[PDB]
Amino acid sequence: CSRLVTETQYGTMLMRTADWVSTAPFDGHMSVFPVGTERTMRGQVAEYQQAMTKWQTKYHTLSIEEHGAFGGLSGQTSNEKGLSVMALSQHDSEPYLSQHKDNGAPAVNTADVVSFITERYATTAEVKAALDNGEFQIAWASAPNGMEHAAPLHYSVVDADGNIMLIQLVKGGEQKIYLGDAESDLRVKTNDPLQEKHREYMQQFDLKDPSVATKMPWSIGGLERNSRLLAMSTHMDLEGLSYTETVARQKGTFDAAALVPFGVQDPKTGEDYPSFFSMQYNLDNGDIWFRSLMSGKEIKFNLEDTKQFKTPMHADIMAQVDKGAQTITWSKM
Amino acid sequence: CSRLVTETQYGTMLMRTADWVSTAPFDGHMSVFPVGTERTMRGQVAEYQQAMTKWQTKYHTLSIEEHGAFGGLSGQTSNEKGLSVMALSQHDSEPYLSQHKDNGAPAVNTADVVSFITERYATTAEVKAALDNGEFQIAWASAPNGMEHAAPLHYSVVDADGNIMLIQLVKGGEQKIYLGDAESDLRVKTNDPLQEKHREYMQQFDLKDPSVATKMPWSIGGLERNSRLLAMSTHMDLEGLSYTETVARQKGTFDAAALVPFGVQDPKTGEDYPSFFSMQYNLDNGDIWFRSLMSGKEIKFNLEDTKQFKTPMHADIMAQVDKGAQTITWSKM
């Protein structure tokens, strides 16, 4: 899984891939939660003393759910204020999940927390304040809805002004929070190892050298995807480009750095890790592009298209894109 | 520039990128030459005793011409028999071009020779025989039409039964022809160095190891693109896929191996080499996909869609796709 934020003259652009082992193919769906929805949390958080059983949607939110392996967990969200939240795999947190300490805040099941944040908050600062004030916590130690074990994930929030927060569970069960903007190294997020280890790795590379990507090892792992996205995004020059050309430039650059093909095995895992789908967002204007790598097809839409919905709605978006749909078919939840 | 042939159950698939330095951006155009067209060669071939001044089109041919930097030279063609012909850059042939010896055959200016071959011949073996019999020769030592110097190019021919021919100008100005099928290493063609050197480089890598791509150096150079296309294609698994899925699998695999992003500089040249546009062909059925990397957009069409035309036609295809065209607007030449 990889994610890039790029500042542009047309908006803050975010691109994210959903990658997994080919033995358990992903299947992306979308849910829309309109303003004022009375929401009920999916799953249990029995490890924590207080549950976020119910909430109300404050901000119109679209949630991309992973149905193929993750049981419907919400992994990439955006709201009408241009806030984006996301969960990506972070296997190096696995040893520590059960050691997350309950601070007494209402705990949100990891199947829904990404959506819950979009539904409640408008800016990165708001979410960091809410965490600090004990408004909610992430239920790190609890299994996601319907799954057997706590999942090793790391979370991030990106707002329309390019403020980034990374939330990563590290040694001892510490919830570590990293802050930065879309020109910091936090504009890139992948998978394992943990963020300190990526930063250590990067110290040998001088990103100012436009030939530096050629000096970086290639692999399908999170380490190499992190380094290559950092290198290739440093030298991405968006001057004089149109909007369409700017979107395309991010896409192209991202794919060169981080699209994971089928058939390549990572010697560190003995497994593959192909990209199944991707999302591109303009957080300033609501533009969304959903691409399936299985069909190679993509649809462009806007969050505004769903703003008329008066009840939650759902779409098997990847399936529809794979069948050649040009518009989304929505169903009541 | 990179090119991949892949045998599939739905047909012989070919993918090719057109890559160049960013300081001279590419602009892809297309011409249609119907059967019976009286053709007049562009340019001169004054270094050669006999010129292919005029010929008649035998096979309905679509020619992809590069207008940005190569003055409208034909770089990628196909015909109604499924023959595909292409020219890619081969900078290691540059010191040898003036040493090519005129064999007395009618010489075809390099602006046209790729189209000429598709307009006259149906199979790879037919092209090989025509060369051997002296029916034409490449004007290696002559500048392409409208340009100052001989261009350092290499040529290849792929037919609908997957027979491949590579033509390179090697030390001392000798013309070397390699033959093989679409399972051989000739299924991949990039840029410098010459083929013997690519083969030498590849001896170190065991292509049967599915983790082998992770053991290969990455660069934007032809050497590294060759190696990675060979690796990634060796483990592409097309069983069970639909036709759409198969086309996409080739695309994505090719992109991971060989799509060159903007901004990365090659330390061997001190220049970049981004991909500007790409073409995908099914040689068995006439399907063609043209994608612009500048806009990210792609159109699908079929050669049969152009049999209606009784005189030559032309389209600024790249410009049209960049403006969001879904179908080609043809002009009389």
With the C-alpha atoms ordered B236, B238, B239, B241, is the resulting torsion angle positive or negative? Answer: positive
Residues from chain B contacting residue A213 (CB–CB below 8 Å): 218, 264
What are B198's strand-pairing partners? none
A123 contact B CB<8A: no
Tell me the nearest-neighbour CA distance from A40 into chain B, angstroms: 38
Six-digit token string for B153: 């190019």
Q: Are B29 and B316 in contact (CB under 8 A)?
A: yes
With the C-alpha atoms ordered A254, A166, A41, A139, is the resulting torsion angle positive or negative? Answer: positive
Cβ contact, residue pair A218, B214, below 8 Å? yes
A260 contact B CB<8A: yes
What DSSP letter does each residue of A135-190 carry, written as one string?
A: S-EE-TTSPPTT-SS---EEEEEE-TT-EEEEEEEEGGGEEEEEEEETTSGGGEE-
Measure CB to CB from residue B255 to each of A245, A249, A255 and give the nearest one: A255
3-state secondary structure of B88: strand
A294 contact B CB<8A: yes
3-state secondary structure of A228: helix
Rounded to a whole number of angstroms, the distance between the first and last alpha carbons of chain B is 27
Burial class (CB in 10 A: 0-12, 13-18, 19+), A206: exposed
Burial class (CB in 10 A: 0-12, 13-18, 19+), B11: buried
Dist CA A1 CA A88 (whole Å):
6
Cβ contact, residue pair A262, B213, below 8 Å? no
Residues from chain B contacting residue A323 (CB–CB below 8 Å): none
Backbone phi, psi, residue B221, to 5°: -70, 160
B235 contact A CB<8A: yes
β-pairing, B84-89 vs B73-79, is: antiparallel
What are A186's strand-pairing partners? none
Tell me the nearest-neighbour CA distance from A117 into chain B, angstroms: 32
Number of helical H runs and strand E runs in chain B: 6, 19
With the C-alpha atoms ordered B240, B245, B248, B252, is the resulting torsion angle positive or negative? Answer: negative
Q: Which residues of B89-123 are buried (b: 16+ CB within 10 A; e: fewer)?
A: bbbbbbebbeebeeeebbbbbbbbbbbbbbbbbbb
Dist CA B325 CA A285 (whole Å):
24
Cβ contact, residue pair A259, B255, below 8 Å? yes
Residue closest to A318 by CA, chosen among A24, A30, A3? A30
B244 contact A CB<8A: yes
Rounded to a whole number of angstroms, the distance between the first and last alpha carbons of chain A is 28
3-state secondary structure of B190: coil
B67 contact A CB<8A: no
Calculate helix-pair angle for B222-234, B195-202, nearest 10 degrees.
60
Name B183's Cβ contacts closer than 8 Å, sequence gap at least 6.
B7, B162
What DSSP letter does each residue of B277-297 carry, written as one string?
A: EEEEEETTT-EEEEEETTT--
Residues from chain B contacting residue A320 (CB–CB below 8 Å): none
Apex A173 CA angle, A169 and A176, nearest 5: 40
Peptide bond into A193 cis (omega under 30): yes
Tell me how far CA of residue B321 lies from CA of A223, A244, B235, in angstroms: 36, 12, 32
Indicate which technique resolved this structure: X-ray
Residue closest to A20 by CA, chosen among A1, A3, A38, A5? A1
Name A260's Cβ contacts closer than 8 Å, sequence gap at least 6.
A17, A19, A220, A225, A272, A273, A274, A275, B256
Residue in chain B closest to A252 (alpha carbons) equals: B261
Residues from chain B contacting residue A218 (CB–CB below 8 Å): 213-214, 216-218
B38 contact A CB<8A: no
Dist CA A288 CA A9 (whole Å):
17
Residue in chain A closest to B22 (alpha carbons) equals: A237
**Which residue in the block uniquely carries the two structure tokens 């968006």?**
A238
Q: Which residues of B294-310 are buried (b: 16+ CB within 10 A; e: fewer)?
A: bbbbbbebebeebeeee
Number of helical H runs and strand E runs in chain A: 6, 19
A229 contact B CB<8A: no
Dist CA B39 CA B55 (whole Å):
5
Strands (E), A57-113: 61-66, 73-79, 84-89, 107-108
With the C-alpha atoms ordered B234, B281, A250, A231, is the resulting torsion angle positive or negative? Answer: positive
Residue closest to B66 by CA, chosen among B52, B86, B51? B86
Tell me how far CA of residue B109 lies from CA of B48, B78, B101, B171, in angstroms: 10, 18, 15, 21
Element (H, E) at A292: strand A287-292
Burial class (CB in 10 A: 0-12, 13-18, 19+), A285: middle
With the C-alpha atoms ordered B182, B183, B186, B188, is the resulting torsion angle positive or negative? Answer: positive
β-pairing, A275-282 vs B84-89, is: unpaired
β-pairing, B61-66 vs B73-79, is: antiparallel
Residues from chain A contacting residue B272 (CB–CB below 8 Å): 210
Q: Are B311 and B330 in contact (CB under 8 A)?
A: no
Residues from chain B contacting residue A300 (CB–CB below 8 Å): none
- Tally A–B CB contacts below 8 A: 128
With the C-alpha atoms ordered B200, B203, B205, B209, is the resulting torsion angle positive or negative? Answer: positive
| A residues 162-221 lying closer than 8 A (beta carbon) to B | 210-211, 213-214, 216-220
Six-digit token string for B77: 């063609």
Tell me how far CA of residue B104 lies from CA of A25, B43, B133, B143, B184, in angstroms: 60, 18, 11, 18, 33
Six-digit token string for A262: 């089928």
Dist CA B39 CA B221 (whole Å):
37
Tell me the nearest-neighbour CA distance from B231 into chain A, angstroms: 9
Cβ contact, residue pair A265, B210, below 8 Å? yes
Q: Are A16 and A301 in contact (CB under 8 A)?
A: no
| A83 Rama sector, left if φ>0, alpha if ψ -120 to 50, beta otherwise | beta
Cβ contact, residue pair B263, A237, below 8 Å? yes
Six-digit token string for B79: 């015909």
Residues from chain B contacting residue A275 (CB–CB below 8 Å): 252
**Which residue in the block uniquely carries the two structure tokens 């001392």?**
B172
B291 contact A CB<8A: no
Residues from chain B contacting residue A15 (CB–CB below 8 Å): none
Cβ neighbours of B271 (radius 10 Å): 12
Strands (E), chain B: 2-8, 11-19, 28-33, 38-40, 54-56, 61-66, 73-79, 84-89, 107-108, 137-138, 153-158, 163-170, 174-181, 188-189, 275-282, 287-292, 298-302, 313-315, 331-332
β-pairing, A107-108 vs A137-138, is: parallel
What DSSP letter does each residue of B202-221 carry, written as one string?
A: HTT--TTSTTGGGGSPP-SS
Q: Are B151 and B66 in contact (CB under 8 A)?
A: no
